[PDB]
Amino acid sequence: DPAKDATPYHVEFPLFRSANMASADKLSTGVGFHSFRIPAVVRTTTGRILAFAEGRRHDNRDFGDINLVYKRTKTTSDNGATLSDWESLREVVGSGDGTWGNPTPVVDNGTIYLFLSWNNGSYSQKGGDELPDGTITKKIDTTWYGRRHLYLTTSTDDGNTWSKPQDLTKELTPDGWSWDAVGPGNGIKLSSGELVVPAMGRNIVGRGTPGQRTWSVQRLNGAGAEGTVCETPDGKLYRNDRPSKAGYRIVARGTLSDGFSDFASDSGLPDPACQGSVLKYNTDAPPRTIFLNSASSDSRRQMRVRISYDADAAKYDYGRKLADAPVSGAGYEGGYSSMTKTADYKIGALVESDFFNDGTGGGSYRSIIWRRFNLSWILNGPNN
């Protein structure tokens, strides 16, 4: 790999700062957030970077009042290189006291399409949970009212403004479903021009052309609830999903026209049952696929970025531990992640971090860290 010959580069700092932090991120209205979780990041065609997260208003839990928030880089050419290159916190949507989350953006020329999940504010995945106002949640069910919905919002001004979210549940989620999830993380645009967005048990596929996209469902037998999707060097699709039980990532390969080979555990990629991220970095020699998750079967605090050179991304190197360049003052790093390729040929990654002050309980403050690094930084790591 010629990329090893470059000087290693890496910067890292907190980008979404929880309520307990100095410079805690708030909206211009004065509305603040206990916690930020569930990152998503994309580089637009101008070079601007858009970073999305769930703004969890009162505590760190997956339900209740959660708004979809974001930051953009101030300019199209700063590549998010320093804290001062990032705009203040904005909101995509936060109407009602419902849960707006699972940001899953994909760029198409220009337009940024942002897929989201939604549920009513008095429902939760398990049900039986107590909201801050005392009320107890009902379990997510199959009714229109109590089910998880799928929304789409679009921006045609480089993320500055967002369309009123459109409910696409009836069209893009199977009838009879209760729980649902899109991403979180990112969708992709194929060489052949289709948009592919990973979702629970399926791909959401945008055919047509830029400005006239048509959305449909490609079902996937045995796919995870939280999926990632990449186009491998060979031109096929690669689903790399979170497993239902801790152990290893589950993988499947396929194409849009003739489906996917069933899902199987990849023993090279241990995972604690957490979200991960994947990135097509480049196509000419040597062709690279980047993968990021917590490389452990029981902890989320073993974040590891890896490179595969394989045409089907069968095998990854050891890669590098993100703990080799730790951040201070923002909690213990590890959890969900999202990656993009910056316009200055770096990998830009968002990674969850947890102060762990109420343990696994709702009071523990959650922040999100932004990192940039070059391939060299990965390749010149201690254990390869």
Short mmCIF file of N, CA and C in Angstrom, two decimals, residues 37-205, unseen atoms left out:
data_model
loop_
_atom_site.label_atom_id
_atom_site.label_comp_id
_atom_site.label_asym_id
_atom_site.label_seq_id
_atom_site.Cartn_x
_atom_site.Cartn_y
_atom_site.Cartn_z
N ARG A 37 -26.66 10.84 20.78
CA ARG A 37 -26.32 9.49 20.35
C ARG A 37 -26.62 9.31 18.85
N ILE A 38 -26.17 8.17 18.32
CA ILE A 38 -26.59 7.69 17.01
C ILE A 38 -26.09 8.63 15.89
N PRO A 39 -24.76 8.65 15.65
CA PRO A 39 -24.16 9.55 14.68
C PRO A 39 -24.36 9.11 13.24
N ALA A 40 -24.34 10.08 12.34
CA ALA A 40 -24.34 9.83 10.91
C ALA A 40 -23.59 10.96 10.28
N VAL A 41 -22.72 10.66 9.32
CA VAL A 41 -21.95 11.70 8.68
C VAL A 41 -21.81 11.47 7.18
N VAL A 42 -21.89 12.55 6.42
CA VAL A 42 -21.68 12.50 4.97
C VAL A 42 -20.96 13.73 4.51
N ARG A 43 -20.12 13.54 3.51
CA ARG A 43 -19.50 14.60 2.78
C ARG A 43 -20.38 14.87 1.56
N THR A 44 -20.76 16.13 1.33
CA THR A 44 -21.61 16.47 0.20
C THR A 44 -20.71 16.68 -1.01
N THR A 45 -21.33 16.86 -2.17
CA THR A 45 -20.55 17.03 -3.39
C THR A 45 -19.79 18.36 -3.42
N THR A 46 -20.12 19.31 -2.54
CA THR A 46 -19.36 20.57 -2.48
C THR A 46 -18.11 20.43 -1.62
N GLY A 47 -18.08 19.38 -0.79
CA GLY A 47 -17.01 19.20 0.16
C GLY A 47 -17.44 19.52 1.59
N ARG A 48 -18.62 20.13 1.75
CA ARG A 48 -19.15 20.40 3.07
C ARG A 48 -19.41 19.07 3.77
N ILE A 49 -19.19 19.01 5.08
CA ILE A 49 -19.54 17.83 5.85
C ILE A 49 -20.78 18.11 6.71
N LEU A 50 -21.72 17.17 6.73
CA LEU A 50 -22.94 17.22 7.53
C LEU A 50 -22.88 16.09 8.54
N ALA A 51 -22.99 16.45 9.82
CA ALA A 51 -22.92 15.50 10.92
C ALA A 51 -24.29 15.51 11.59
N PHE A 52 -24.91 14.34 11.72
CA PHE A 52 -26.24 14.20 12.28
C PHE A 52 -26.16 13.40 13.58
N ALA A 53 -27.11 13.64 14.46
CA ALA A 53 -27.23 12.86 15.70
C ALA A 53 -28.64 12.94 16.25
N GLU A 54 -28.92 12.01 17.15
CA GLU A 54 -30.09 12.07 17.99
C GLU A 54 -29.82 12.94 19.21
N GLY A 55 -30.62 14.00 19.33
CA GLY A 55 -30.63 14.86 20.51
C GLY A 55 -31.64 14.33 21.50
N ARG A 56 -31.12 13.67 22.53
CA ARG A 56 -31.96 13.04 23.55
C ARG A 56 -32.11 14.02 24.70
N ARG A 57 -33.30 14.60 24.77
CA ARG A 57 -33.56 15.79 25.58
C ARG A 57 -33.34 15.61 27.07
N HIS A 58 -33.99 14.62 27.67
CA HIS A 58 -34.02 14.48 29.14
C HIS A 58 -33.12 13.41 29.76
N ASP A 59 -32.73 12.42 28.97
CA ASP A 59 -31.86 11.35 29.45
C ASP A 59 -31.28 10.63 28.23
N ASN A 60 -30.53 9.56 28.43
CA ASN A 60 -29.84 8.91 27.30
C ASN A 60 -30.62 7.77 26.61
N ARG A 61 -31.84 7.51 27.06
CA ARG A 61 -32.60 6.36 26.59
C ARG A 61 -33.14 6.53 25.17
N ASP A 62 -33.42 5.39 24.52
CA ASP A 62 -33.84 5.34 23.11
C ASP A 62 -35.25 5.88 22.78
N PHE A 63 -36.02 6.23 23.79
CA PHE A 63 -37.41 6.63 23.64
C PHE A 63 -37.68 7.94 24.37
N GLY A 64 -38.88 8.46 24.18
CA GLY A 64 -39.28 9.74 24.75
C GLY A 64 -38.98 10.87 23.76
N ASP A 65 -38.70 12.06 24.30
CA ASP A 65 -38.48 13.26 23.48
C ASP A 65 -37.06 13.28 22.91
N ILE A 66 -36.98 12.98 21.61
CA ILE A 66 -35.69 12.93 20.91
C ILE A 66 -35.85 13.68 19.59
N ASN A 67 -34.95 14.64 19.38
CA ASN A 67 -34.97 15.46 18.18
C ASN A 67 -33.81 15.04 17.28
N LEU A 68 -33.95 15.24 15.98
CA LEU A 68 -32.86 14.94 15.03
C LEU A 68 -32.08 16.25 14.81
N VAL A 69 -30.82 16.27 15.25
CA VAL A 69 -30.01 17.48 15.23
C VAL A 69 -28.83 17.30 14.31
N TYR A 70 -28.15 18.39 13.99
CA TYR A 70 -27.03 18.32 13.06
C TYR A 70 -26.12 19.52 13.16
N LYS A 71 -24.91 19.35 12.64
CA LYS A 71 -23.97 20.43 12.43
C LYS A 71 -23.41 20.31 11.01
N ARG A 72 -23.09 21.42 10.39
CA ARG A 72 -22.40 21.42 9.11
C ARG A 72 -21.08 22.08 9.33
N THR A 73 -20.10 21.77 8.49
CA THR A 73 -18.91 22.60 8.43
C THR A 73 -19.28 24.00 7.93
N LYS A 74 -18.57 25.02 8.41
CA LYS A 74 -18.86 26.40 8.05
C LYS A 74 -18.64 26.67 6.59
N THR A 75 -17.65 26.00 6.02
CA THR A 75 -17.32 26.21 4.63
C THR A 75 -17.31 24.86 3.92
N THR A 76 -17.16 24.92 2.61
CA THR A 76 -17.15 23.69 1.81
C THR A 76 -15.76 23.10 1.74
N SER A 77 -14.75 23.79 2.26
CA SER A 77 -13.37 23.40 2.01
C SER A 77 -12.52 23.26 3.26
N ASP A 78 -13.13 23.34 4.43
CA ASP A 78 -12.37 23.23 5.68
C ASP A 78 -12.23 21.80 6.20
N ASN A 79 -13.06 20.90 5.68
CA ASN A 79 -12.95 19.48 5.98
C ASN A 79 -13.13 19.14 7.45
N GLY A 80 -13.76 20.05 8.20
CA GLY A 80 -14.00 19.82 9.59
C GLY A 80 -12.73 19.66 10.42
N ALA A 81 -11.63 20.29 9.99
CA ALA A 81 -10.29 19.98 10.52
C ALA A 81 -10.10 20.41 11.98
N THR A 82 -10.82 21.45 12.40
CA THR A 82 -10.75 21.98 13.78
C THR A 82 -12.15 22.26 14.30
N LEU A 83 -12.28 22.35 15.61
CA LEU A 83 -13.58 22.68 16.23
C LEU A 83 -14.21 23.96 15.66
N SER A 84 -13.39 24.96 15.39
CA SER A 84 -13.85 26.25 14.85
C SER A 84 -14.36 26.18 13.40
N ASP A 85 -14.13 25.06 12.72
CA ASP A 85 -14.68 24.84 11.39
C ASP A 85 -16.12 24.35 11.36
N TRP A 86 -16.73 24.14 12.53
CA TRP A 86 -18.08 23.59 12.63
C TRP A 86 -19.11 24.64 13.07
N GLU A 87 -20.24 24.69 12.38
CA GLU A 87 -21.35 25.55 12.78
C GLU A 87 -21.93 25.10 14.11
N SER A 88 -22.71 25.99 14.71
CA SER A 88 -23.48 25.61 15.88
C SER A 88 -24.62 24.63 15.56
N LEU A 89 -25.08 23.99 16.61
CA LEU A 89 -26.15 23.00 16.55
C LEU A 89 -27.43 23.51 15.92
N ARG A 90 -27.96 22.73 14.99
CA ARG A 90 -29.25 22.97 14.36
C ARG A 90 -30.13 21.73 14.45
N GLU A 91 -31.39 21.91 14.08
CA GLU A 91 -32.38 20.83 14.14
C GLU A 91 -32.92 20.54 12.78
N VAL A 92 -32.99 19.27 12.43
CA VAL A 92 -33.69 18.85 11.22
C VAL A 92 -35.18 18.78 11.50
N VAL A 93 -35.54 18.05 12.55
CA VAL A 93 -36.93 17.88 12.96
C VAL A 93 -36.95 17.55 14.45
N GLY A 94 -37.91 18.12 15.18
CA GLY A 94 -38.10 17.76 16.59
C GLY A 94 -39.52 18.00 17.06
N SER A 95 -40.46 17.97 16.13
CA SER A 95 -41.85 18.32 16.39
C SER A 95 -42.55 17.22 17.18
N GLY A 96 -43.50 17.62 18.03
CA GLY A 96 -44.12 16.70 18.97
C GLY A 96 -43.12 16.27 20.02
N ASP A 97 -43.58 15.41 20.93
CA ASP A 97 -42.70 14.83 21.95
C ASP A 97 -42.29 13.40 21.57
N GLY A 98 -42.30 13.12 20.26
CA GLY A 98 -42.01 11.79 19.76
C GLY A 98 -40.52 11.53 19.66
N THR A 99 -40.18 10.34 19.21
CA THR A 99 -38.80 9.98 18.96
C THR A 99 -38.48 10.06 17.47
N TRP A 100 -37.57 10.97 17.12
CA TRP A 100 -37.05 11.08 15.76
C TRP A 100 -35.60 10.64 15.81
N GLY A 101 -35.25 9.55 15.13
CA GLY A 101 -33.88 9.08 15.17
C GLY A 101 -33.45 8.26 13.98
N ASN A 102 -32.42 7.45 14.20
CA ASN A 102 -31.81 6.63 13.15
C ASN A 102 -31.42 7.40 11.88
N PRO A 103 -30.64 8.48 12.01
CA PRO A 103 -30.29 9.19 10.81
C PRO A 103 -29.54 8.32 9.84
N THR A 104 -30.04 8.28 8.60
CA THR A 104 -29.39 7.51 7.55
C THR A 104 -29.38 8.32 6.25
N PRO A 105 -28.38 9.18 6.11
CA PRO A 105 -28.28 9.99 4.90
C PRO A 105 -27.60 9.31 3.71
N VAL A 106 -27.98 9.75 2.52
CA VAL A 106 -27.23 9.44 1.32
C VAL A 106 -27.21 10.66 0.40
N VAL A 107 -26.05 10.95 -0.17
CA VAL A 107 -25.87 12.06 -1.10
C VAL A 107 -26.10 11.59 -2.54
N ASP A 108 -26.86 12.39 -3.29
CA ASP A 108 -27.17 12.15 -4.71
C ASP A 108 -27.07 13.51 -5.45
N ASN A 109 -25.90 13.80 -6.06
CA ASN A 109 -25.68 15.08 -6.71
C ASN A 109 -25.90 16.14 -5.66
CA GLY A 110 -27.21 18.16 -5.29
C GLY A 110 -28.26 18.00 -4.21
N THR A 111 -28.68 16.76 -3.97
CA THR A 111 -29.67 16.47 -2.98
C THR A 111 -29.07 15.57 -1.90
N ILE A 112 -29.36 15.88 -0.65
CA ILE A 112 -29.07 14.95 0.43
C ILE A 112 -30.39 14.36 0.90
N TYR A 113 -30.49 13.03 0.83
CA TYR A 113 -31.66 12.34 1.29
C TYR A 113 -31.36 11.85 2.69
N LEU A 114 -32.20 12.18 3.64
CA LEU A 114 -32.01 11.72 5.01
C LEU A 114 -33.21 10.86 5.42
N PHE A 115 -32.97 9.55 5.52
CA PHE A 115 -33.97 8.64 6.06
C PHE A 115 -33.92 8.66 7.59
N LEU A 116 -35.08 8.51 8.21
CA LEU A 116 -35.23 8.55 9.67
C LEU A 116 -36.25 7.53 10.10
N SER A 117 -36.14 7.11 11.36
CA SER A 117 -37.21 6.38 12.01
C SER A 117 -37.93 7.28 12.99
N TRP A 118 -39.20 6.96 13.24
CA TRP A 118 -40.02 7.69 14.18
C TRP A 118 -40.91 6.74 14.98
N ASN A 119 -41.18 7.09 16.23
CA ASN A 119 -42.30 6.49 16.96
C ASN A 119 -42.96 7.51 17.89
N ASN A 120 -44.22 7.27 18.22
CA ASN A 120 -44.94 8.11 19.18
C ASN A 120 -44.23 8.13 20.53
N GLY A 121 -44.30 9.27 21.21
CA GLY A 121 -43.55 9.50 22.44
C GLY A 121 -43.96 8.70 23.67
N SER A 122 -45.10 8.03 23.62
CA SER A 122 -45.53 7.20 24.75
C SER A 122 -45.46 5.70 24.43
N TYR A 123 -44.67 5.35 23.41
CA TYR A 123 -44.29 3.98 23.10
C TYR A 123 -42.77 3.79 23.20
N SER A 124 -42.35 2.57 23.50
CA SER A 124 -40.95 2.19 23.53
C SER A 124 -40.78 0.75 23.03
N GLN A 125 -39.55 0.36 22.70
CA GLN A 125 -39.28 -0.95 22.09
C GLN A 125 -39.77 -2.09 23.00
N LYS A 126 -39.47 -1.99 24.29
CA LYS A 126 -39.90 -3.00 25.29
C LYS A 126 -41.27 -2.69 25.87
N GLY A 127 -41.59 -1.41 25.97
CA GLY A 127 -42.76 -0.99 26.72
C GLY A 127 -42.45 -1.11 28.21
N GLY A 128 -43.30 -0.50 29.03
CA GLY A 128 -43.13 -0.54 30.47
C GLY A 128 -42.10 0.41 31.04
N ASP A 129 -41.63 1.35 30.22
CA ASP A 129 -40.61 2.30 30.65
C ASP A 129 -41.27 3.56 31.17
N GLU A 130 -40.64 4.18 32.17
CA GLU A 130 -41.16 5.38 32.81
C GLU A 130 -40.57 6.67 32.23
N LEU A 131 -41.43 7.51 31.65
CA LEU A 131 -41.03 8.81 31.11
C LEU A 131 -40.80 9.81 32.25
N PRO A 132 -40.04 10.90 32.00
CA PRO A 132 -39.75 11.91 33.03
C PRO A 132 -40.98 12.49 33.73
N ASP A 133 -42.10 12.59 33.00
CA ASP A 133 -43.37 13.07 33.57
C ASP A 133 -44.20 12.00 34.30
N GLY A 134 -43.60 10.84 34.59
CA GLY A 134 -44.26 9.79 35.37
C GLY A 134 -44.96 8.71 34.55
N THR A 135 -45.49 9.08 33.38
CA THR A 135 -46.22 8.16 32.50
C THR A 135 -45.39 6.93 32.12
N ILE A 136 -46.07 5.79 31.97
CA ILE A 136 -45.44 4.52 31.59
C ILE A 136 -45.70 4.21 30.12
N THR A 137 -44.67 3.78 29.40
CA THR A 137 -44.79 3.57 27.95
C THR A 137 -45.49 2.28 27.59
N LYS A 138 -46.16 2.31 26.44
CA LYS A 138 -46.71 1.11 25.85
C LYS A 138 -45.68 0.51 24.90
N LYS A 139 -45.78 -0.79 24.69
CA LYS A 139 -44.86 -1.47 23.81
C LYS A 139 -45.19 -1.14 22.34
N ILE A 140 -44.15 -0.90 21.54
CA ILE A 140 -44.33 -0.68 20.10
C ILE A 140 -45.11 -1.85 19.54
N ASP A 141 -46.12 -1.57 18.74
CA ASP A 141 -46.94 -2.65 18.16
C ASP A 141 -47.15 -2.47 16.66
N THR A 142 -48.10 -3.22 16.09
CA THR A 142 -48.31 -3.23 14.64
C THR A 142 -49.32 -2.19 14.13
N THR A 143 -49.99 -1.49 15.04
CA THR A 143 -50.97 -0.44 14.67
C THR A 143 -50.26 0.78 14.09
N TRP A 144 -50.96 1.53 13.24
CA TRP A 144 -50.41 2.74 12.63
C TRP A 144 -49.87 3.71 13.69
N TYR A 145 -50.63 3.84 14.77
CA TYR A 145 -50.32 4.74 15.87
C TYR A 145 -49.09 4.29 16.65
N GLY A 146 -49.01 2.99 16.93
CA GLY A 146 -47.99 2.43 17.84
C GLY A 146 -46.79 1.79 17.19
N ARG A 147 -46.72 1.82 15.87
CA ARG A 147 -45.61 1.22 15.14
C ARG A 147 -44.48 2.20 14.89
N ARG A 148 -43.32 1.66 14.52
CA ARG A 148 -42.19 2.47 14.06
C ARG A 148 -42.37 2.84 12.60
N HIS A 149 -42.23 4.14 12.32
CA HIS A 149 -42.44 4.70 11.00
C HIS A 149 -41.10 5.00 10.33
N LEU A 150 -41.16 5.21 9.02
CA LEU A 150 -40.00 5.50 8.22
C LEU A 150 -40.29 6.82 7.54
N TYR A 151 -39.42 7.81 7.78
CA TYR A 151 -39.53 9.14 7.18
C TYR A 151 -38.38 9.47 6.27
N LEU A 152 -38.63 10.41 5.35
CA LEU A 152 -37.61 10.96 4.49
C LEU A 152 -37.71 12.47 4.49
N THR A 153 -36.56 13.12 4.69
CA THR A 153 -36.42 14.56 4.50
C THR A 153 -35.26 14.80 3.56
N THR A 154 -35.31 15.90 2.82
CA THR A 154 -34.34 16.15 1.77
C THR A 154 -33.84 17.55 1.93
N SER A 155 -32.59 17.75 1.56
CA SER A 155 -32.04 19.10 1.44
C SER A 155 -31.46 19.26 0.05
N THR A 156 -31.74 20.40 -0.60
CA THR A 156 -31.14 20.75 -1.88
C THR A 156 -30.26 21.99 -1.80
N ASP A 157 -29.93 22.40 -0.59
CA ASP A 157 -29.09 23.58 -0.37
C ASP A 157 -27.94 23.23 0.59
N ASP A 158 -27.35 22.07 0.33
CA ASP A 158 -26.14 21.67 1.03
C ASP A 158 -26.37 21.55 2.54
N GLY A 159 -27.57 21.13 2.94
CA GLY A 159 -27.89 20.92 4.33
C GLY A 159 -28.36 22.12 5.12
N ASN A 160 -28.58 23.25 4.44
CA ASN A 160 -28.92 24.44 5.13
C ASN A 160 -30.36 24.37 5.61
N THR A 161 -31.23 23.83 4.76
CA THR A 161 -32.65 23.68 5.08
C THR A 161 -33.11 22.28 4.66
N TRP A 162 -34.15 21.82 5.33
CA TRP A 162 -34.63 20.45 5.21
C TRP A 162 -36.12 20.43 4.93
N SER A 163 -36.57 19.56 4.04
CA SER A 163 -38.01 19.50 3.74
C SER A 163 -38.79 18.93 4.93
N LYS A 164 -40.07 19.27 5.02
CA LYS A 164 -40.97 18.65 5.97
C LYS A 164 -40.90 17.12 5.80
N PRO A 165 -40.52 16.37 6.86
CA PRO A 165 -40.38 14.92 6.67
C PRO A 165 -41.63 14.24 6.13
N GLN A 166 -41.42 13.37 5.15
CA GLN A 166 -42.49 12.66 4.47
C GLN A 166 -42.54 11.24 5.04
N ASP A 167 -43.71 10.83 5.51
CA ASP A 167 -43.89 9.45 5.99
C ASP A 167 -43.97 8.44 4.84
N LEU A 168 -43.00 7.55 4.76
CA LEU A 168 -42.93 6.59 3.67
C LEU A 168 -43.14 5.14 4.15
N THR A 169 -43.72 5.00 5.33
CA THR A 169 -43.88 3.70 6.01
C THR A 169 -44.69 2.70 5.16
N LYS A 170 -45.85 3.15 4.70
CA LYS A 170 -46.74 2.29 3.92
C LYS A 170 -46.06 1.83 2.66
N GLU A 171 -45.24 2.70 2.08
CA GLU A 171 -44.54 2.37 0.86
C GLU A 171 -43.28 1.52 1.07
N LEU A 172 -42.52 1.78 2.14
CA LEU A 172 -41.16 1.24 2.25
C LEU A 172 -40.91 0.33 3.46
N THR A 173 -41.94 0.12 4.27
CA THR A 173 -41.87 -0.83 5.36
C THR A 173 -43.00 -1.86 5.19
N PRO A 174 -42.68 -3.16 5.32
CA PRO A 174 -43.72 -4.18 5.15
C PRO A 174 -44.89 -3.96 6.09
N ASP A 175 -46.12 -4.11 5.58
CA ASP A 175 -47.31 -4.16 6.44
C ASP A 175 -47.17 -5.25 7.52
N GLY A 176 -47.71 -4.98 8.69
CA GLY A 176 -47.66 -5.90 9.83
C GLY A 176 -46.43 -5.82 10.71
N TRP A 177 -45.51 -4.91 10.40
CA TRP A 177 -44.30 -4.80 11.19
C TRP A 177 -44.60 -3.91 12.38
N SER A 178 -43.87 -4.12 13.47
CA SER A 178 -44.01 -3.29 14.67
C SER A 178 -42.72 -2.46 14.77
N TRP A 179 -41.68 -3.04 15.35
CA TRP A 179 -40.38 -2.39 15.37
C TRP A 179 -39.87 -2.27 13.94
N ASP A 180 -39.10 -1.21 13.70
CA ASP A 180 -38.39 -1.04 12.44
C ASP A 180 -37.18 -0.14 12.73
N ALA A 181 -36.20 -0.20 11.84
CA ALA A 181 -35.04 0.71 11.90
C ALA A 181 -34.46 0.92 10.51
N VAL A 182 -33.97 2.13 10.24
CA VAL A 182 -33.21 2.39 9.05
C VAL A 182 -31.79 2.70 9.53
N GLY A 183 -30.77 2.25 8.80
CA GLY A 183 -29.39 2.44 9.24
C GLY A 183 -29.22 1.97 10.68
N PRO A 184 -28.72 2.82 11.58
CA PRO A 184 -28.26 4.19 11.32
C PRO A 184 -26.87 4.24 10.71
N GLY A 185 -26.55 5.35 10.06
CA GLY A 185 -25.22 5.61 9.58
C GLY A 185 -25.18 6.29 8.24
N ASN A 186 -25.29 5.51 7.18
CA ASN A 186 -25.33 6.07 5.82
C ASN A 186 -25.88 5.07 4.82
N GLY A 187 -26.39 5.64 3.73
CA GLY A 187 -26.68 4.94 2.50
C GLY A 187 -25.56 5.22 1.51
N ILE A 188 -25.65 4.63 0.31
CA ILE A 188 -24.61 4.72 -0.69
C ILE A 188 -25.20 4.96 -2.07
N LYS A 189 -24.36 5.44 -2.97
CA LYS A 189 -24.71 5.56 -4.38
C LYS A 189 -23.79 4.63 -5.11
N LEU A 190 -24.38 3.71 -5.89
CA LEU A 190 -23.61 2.75 -6.67
C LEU A 190 -23.01 3.40 -7.91
N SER A 191 -21.94 2.78 -8.41
CA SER A 191 -21.34 3.10 -9.70
C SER A 191 -22.37 3.22 -10.81
N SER A 192 -23.33 2.29 -10.81
CA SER A 192 -24.42 2.28 -11.79
C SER A 192 -25.53 3.33 -11.53
N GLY A 193 -25.43 4.07 -10.43
CA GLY A 193 -26.31 5.20 -10.16
C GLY A 193 -27.45 5.01 -9.17
N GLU A 194 -27.72 3.78 -8.75
CA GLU A 194 -28.81 3.53 -7.82
C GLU A 194 -28.37 3.98 -6.42
N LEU A 195 -29.34 4.38 -5.63
CA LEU A 195 -29.11 4.66 -4.21
C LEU A 195 -29.55 3.44 -3.43
N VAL A 196 -28.73 3.05 -2.44
CA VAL A 196 -29.06 1.88 -1.61
C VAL A 196 -28.93 2.30 -0.14
N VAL A 197 -30.04 2.20 0.59
CA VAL A 197 -30.09 2.57 2.00
C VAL A 197 -30.38 1.33 2.83
N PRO A 198 -29.49 1.01 3.79
CA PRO A 198 -29.68 -0.20 4.59
C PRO A 198 -30.73 0.01 5.66
N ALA A 199 -31.61 -0.98 5.82
CA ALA A 199 -32.64 -0.93 6.80
C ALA A 199 -32.87 -2.34 7.36
N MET A 200 -33.68 -2.43 8.39
CA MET A 200 -33.96 -3.71 9.07
C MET A 200 -34.55 -4.69 8.05
N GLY A 201 -33.90 -5.83 7.91
CA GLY A 201 -34.35 -6.90 7.02
C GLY A 201 -34.53 -6.55 5.56
N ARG A 202 -33.84 -5.53 5.05
CA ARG A 202 -34.07 -5.07 3.67
C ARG A 202 -33.17 -3.92 3.27
N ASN A 203 -33.03 -3.73 1.95
CA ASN A 203 -32.48 -2.50 1.38
C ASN A 203 -33.61 -1.63 0.87
N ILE A 204 -33.45 -0.32 1.04
CA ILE A 204 -34.34 0.66 0.43
C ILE A 204 -33.55 1.14 -0.77
N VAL A 205 -34.17 1.06 -1.96
CA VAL A 205 -33.44 1.25 -3.19
C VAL A 205 -34.09 2.40 -3.95
#
